[PDB]
Design an enzyme around this catalytic site. Structure first.
Site, mmCIF file in Angstrom:
data_model
loop_
_atom_site.group_PDB
_atom_site.id
_atom_site.type_symbol
_atom_site.label_atom_id
_atom_site.label_comp_id
_atom_site.label_asym_id
_atom_site.label_seq_id
_atom_site.Cartn_x
_atom_site.Cartn_y
_atom_site.Cartn_z
ATOM 1 N N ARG A 13 4.827 6.670 15.875
ATOM 2 C CA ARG A 13 4.773 7.169 14.509
ATOM 3 C C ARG A 13 4.318 8.615 14.490
ATOM 4 O O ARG A 13 3.379 8.994 15.194
ATOM 5 C CB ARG A 13 3.832 6.346 13.656
ATOM 6 C CG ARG A 13 3.856 6.715 12.182
ATOM 7 C CD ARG A 13 2.961 5.795 11.406
ATOM 8 N NE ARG A 13 1.563 6.015 11.752
ATOM 9 C CZ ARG A 13 0.557 5.276 11.307
ATOM 10 N NH1 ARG A 13 0.762 4.199 10.560
ATOM 11 N NH2 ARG A 13 -0.689 5.624 11.620
ATOM 12 N N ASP A 57 0.190 4.992 1.848
ATOM 13 C CA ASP A 57 -0.735 5.410 2.911
ATOM 14 C C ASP A 57 -1.780 6.402 2.440
ATOM 15 O O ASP A 57 -1.469 7.385 1.763
ATOM 16 C CB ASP A 57 0.016 6.020 4.080
ATOM 17 C CG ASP A 57 0.854 5.018 4.810
ATOM 18 O OD1 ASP A 57 0.464 3.819 4.877
ATOM 19 O OD2 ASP A 57 1.929 5.444 5.289
ATOM 20 N N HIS A 107 0.824 -1.188 0.000
ATOM 21 C CA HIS A 107 0.000 0.000 0.000
ATOM 22 C C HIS A 107 0.865 1.247 0.000
ATOM 23 O O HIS A 107 2.057 1.224 0.311
ATOM 24 C CB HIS A 107 -0.980 0.000 1.201
ATOM 25 C CG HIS A 107 -0.319 0.115 2.533
ATOM 26 N ND1 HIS A 107 0.405 -0.915 3.091
ATOM 27 C CD2 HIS A 107 -0.254 1.142 3.417
ATOM 28 C CE1 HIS A 107 0.893 -0.528 4.257
ATOM 29 N NE2 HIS A 107 0.511 0.711 4.474
ATOM 30 N N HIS A 160 4.703 0.281 0.754
ATOM 31 C CA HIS A 160 5.325 -0.533 1.784
ATOM 32 C C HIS A 160 4.385 -1.652 2.194
ATOM 33 O O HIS A 160 3.209 -1.685 1.814
ATOM 34 C CB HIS A 160 5.769 0.328 3.005
ATOM 35 C CG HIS A 160 4.669 1.146 3.633
ATOM 36 N ND1 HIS A 160 4.241 2.348 3.112
ATOM 37 C CD2 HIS A 160 3.927 0.943 4.755
ATOM 38 C CE1 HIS A 160 3.269 2.837 3.867
ATOM 39 N NE2 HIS A 160 3.073 2.015 4.880
HETATM 40 CO CO LIG Z 1 1.260 2.142 5.897
#
Ligand SMILES: [Co+2]
Ligand SMILES: [Co+2]
Ligand SMILES: [Co+2]
Ligand SMILES: [Co+2]
Ligand SMILES: [Co+2]
Ligand SMILES: [Co+2]
Ligand code: NA
Ligand code: NA
Ligand code: NA
Ligand code: NA
Ligand code: NA
Ligand code: NA
Lengths: 284, 284, 280, 280
Positions: D243, D95, D93, D229
């Protein structure tokens, strides 16, 4: 299997481990036995910092595993027919494969050291065929247990085919593993060719899922040792520099599994194989 | 195109029509011209109840369309090299194809009469390549307009390849049609082989959708006449009885389209074609 | 008296010399035999068939559906009106397999439509099964599949054997179809996708199908238990059929040889092949 | 002072000699340059990086996401807590491409987890585009695609170029991904499926990807505009990451060369490839 002697750094949950604190040059019997157990547990192991490993020691090490291939034609190190020279120029092909499964007795495994190459580029990947089989659902494991497949190669200088179980037992662990691979498997013998294509297409992709593989970046002096009975591997084709490896090949596998539960598929006279999926008729 | 002379019964909206009230044996110029217009409109036409059609009349009829093939080796009727004998025993293969597209000049069309066969079984299907092209969306039609493809065959006794536009114009209607087919097309020349596989896989299935095809059941005395420039056909393999046809083949097509908008794809030295989809290595 | 003209060796036959209006029990027995042999039969020249006779004919096979919402002939809830406008979908299917009791079969007559266009195809699910090699037949005998539908005003699912035994012939037939089968219950979804993709294509091979061009007055009768069918979408003219649907099938096959596949919590199905996320 | 160790020739580099805690503007400029060159960079040995420094670092790139519902570090709404338990999904994917403004990129540090297992892979979308032959690059330059998501508590779709021009490098990158791309807008759905299926597989070829094994104290920084990723799903131990997500991308490419494909009324999408109708 107990392996507590060295510093072991696994690459992934599926397979692969880098073994520190070992010197191959004058390895003892006891340290070799430990490396062999680590190979049976991790399927491929990596030994860094072995620059200068002598030819005599490399051959002795390989012979601890079995008889070494003395290839008739592939180049070998001067004075040493067992140490094969692998050169990106002299001969790459990025395709998932298990070595020489088109022969009735493929190798047990190999010892490879990349002595010249780029700092990045040319990684090798390995896959865990135990997990590829175990991850199939029960109805499909039961089907494959009773099948065999023809493996073959037809290139200038080499024509060979062999029939192997689709699921083999590792003789030294007793655990079952898938034994088909994209490069050399042709077709499942008890299915018609179209059914075989469909099932093999699924198995090839499933068996090389990221959850079943590892990826190793070569460094000066690194040695990889792998068990060809229960792995596939893949050489990444992302470099243009000269790349040279020294390789010793341990002969003597006989892939064995269940007796097939069905006869070979027999076509009728004149029957034509029409693949359901397109491949070009002309390669490059 | 105006066609009002005979009783015409179309098979499907896409193509095919059965023409009643015609006698081929001594057909007039005016009636032939009407059959030719019906061929340009319906792509394949069927003429029932022509039992006993003489050899001389069959050849004359074919020659109204162009030069007739006098095949060197395929069997022919005694005394008449232009009337080829097709026998299910002597030589079937159920695969969508356009005739002889592996040659630079495929036939314009054929006249076929099945003189011996089962009452059911052995139907022939045809497809409309105009509709196969027109049914593609505008971005994909524009892409194909600028591509060519290699068509090839490699069997004992015959090795031939030819490059043709992927989209050709029919010289006599001015309408554009797809010109690839599963049996003989190898690969698109300006794409790499893997891209070609993916696009051809889609085109082959799309082009033989039920909405673009017709299916004809042969009866004693039935004659089929088809335009090979803008159709594919498929012989259904569902019978075991002896099946014999008489066939006249009209030569002289040159498939022509737009100038290619890109050069041929050039691989690098040593590059290997690894198909994304499995085909077996051994046929039957 | 009946002259039988098979369409293909796989299935389908046109039956001449029949008059359905007052058919006798003994002549009906012969039609029944021919349906078990040919799976779908076509009866031409039946213009004017009365509503009461049409209903009595369907009732010889079983209970007739009285659909709550499909329009029906004035006065006759069992005779459904199928209009290309009001309701097509070109997709291989077996009727209502998302239900635990699909129809046994149907009787259809296309009373309005174009002279060409709108053919219907049928496939032989006996041949689709028999054409699989022995290892694969053995596997499928032991499997079941979930069939489902989720549209506005209809949610249904049902589990059926992948291979069913026809109650009258004892012959085994494939029982999955592209339109309504979701997944094989004992495999994981990805394995299921791969096998069903192969079976769908194989089962509708030209050697297993027939294609029928409708003519005024022609009646089609088919056994929904061992066929698929496909409505060709190549026309724009108004097309109307009168249909009677015979209820009462219970697909029956071997007890499964394995338990349902059970995913672990949080497991996500990632199909190996792309489908768009938005339809039209 | 930085020693750069590329993972593969396609992308990825581990940067030693960095201290993020008090990084200077000039050293940050060098990291930025290396991110445009390597697409994803890994900074080891950053145990103890303060929350305030982590936030200031992300803010050098743009505005930070303050997710309304994802848990965050006590006191710091910008530092998201990613727990394998509480929230994995192994699927390639990019993001949030179902949104009109996806993130520019992210800064991720796996602070708890197993010594092996849970690798992350990234792919180079520049190489995925450049590796297509000229006719196909020409086609894709003129196309757009709808990206979408439909889950409980989130419905979103967005249209983006299939080929985007990176704002800083001017280099073209593929901009479709398996997880969130639905369909190409100018093709019909079946053509779209066929092309996207090819592109998804081609774009994640081993020659275009790298695979990173997380170690304590390691920070990954990546450019979400030109990568995909994949989180490898090969562990069961507790895995926690911190994150920070940098908002503000607007994928930009050529004006489409064709109108959207328009189906006719009542047209049904029948995928050529099987997906199950029921997930897990
Ligand atoms: Co992601
Ligand atoms: Co020598
Ligand atoms: Co090898
Ligand atoms: Co002669
Ligand atoms: Co032909
Ligand atoms: Co139906
Ligand atoms: Na030895
Ligand atoms: Na197949
Ligand atoms: Na053995
Ligand atoms: Na002539
Ligand atoms: Na391909
Ligand atoms: Na010409």
């Amino acid at each position: 299997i107990i392996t507590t002697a060295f510093e072991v750094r696994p690459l992934t949950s599926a397979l692969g481990a880098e073994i520190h604190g070992v010197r191959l040059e004058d390895i003892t019997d006891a340290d070799f036995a430990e490396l062999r157990r680590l190979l049976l547990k991790h399927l491929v192991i990596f030994i860094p910092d072995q620059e200068g490993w002598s030819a005599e020691s490399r051959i002795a090490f390989g012979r601890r595993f079995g008889e070494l291939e003395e290839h008739a034609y592939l180049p070998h190190l001067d004075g040493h027919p067992q140490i094969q020279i692998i050169d990106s120029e002299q001969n790459k092909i990025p395709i998932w494969h298990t070595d020489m499964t088109y022969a009735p007795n493929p190798p047990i495994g190999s010892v490879l050291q990349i002595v010249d190459g780029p700092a990045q580029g040319g990684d090798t990947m390995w896959s865990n065929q135990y997990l590829a089989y175990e991850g199939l659902s029960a109805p499909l494991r039961d089907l494959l247990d009773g099948l065999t497949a023809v493996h073959s190669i037809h290139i200038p200088g080499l024509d060979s085919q062999a029939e192997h179980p689709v699921v083999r037992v590792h003789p030294e662990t007793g655990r079952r593993a898938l034994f088909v691979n994209r490069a050399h498997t042709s077709h499942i013998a008890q299915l018609n060719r179209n059914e075989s294509d469909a099932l093999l297409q699924y198995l090839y992709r499933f068996s090389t899922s990221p959850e079943f593989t590892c990826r190793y970046q070569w460094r000066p002096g690194s040695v990889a040792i792998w068990d060809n009975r229960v792995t596939q591997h893949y050489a990444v084709d992302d470099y243009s520099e000269h790349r040279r490896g020294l390789r010793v090949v341990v002969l003597g596998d006989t892939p064995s599994g269940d007796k097939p539960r069905w006869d070979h598929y027999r076509p009728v006279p004149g029957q034509r194989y029409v693949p359901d999926w397109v491949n070009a008729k002309e390669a490059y």
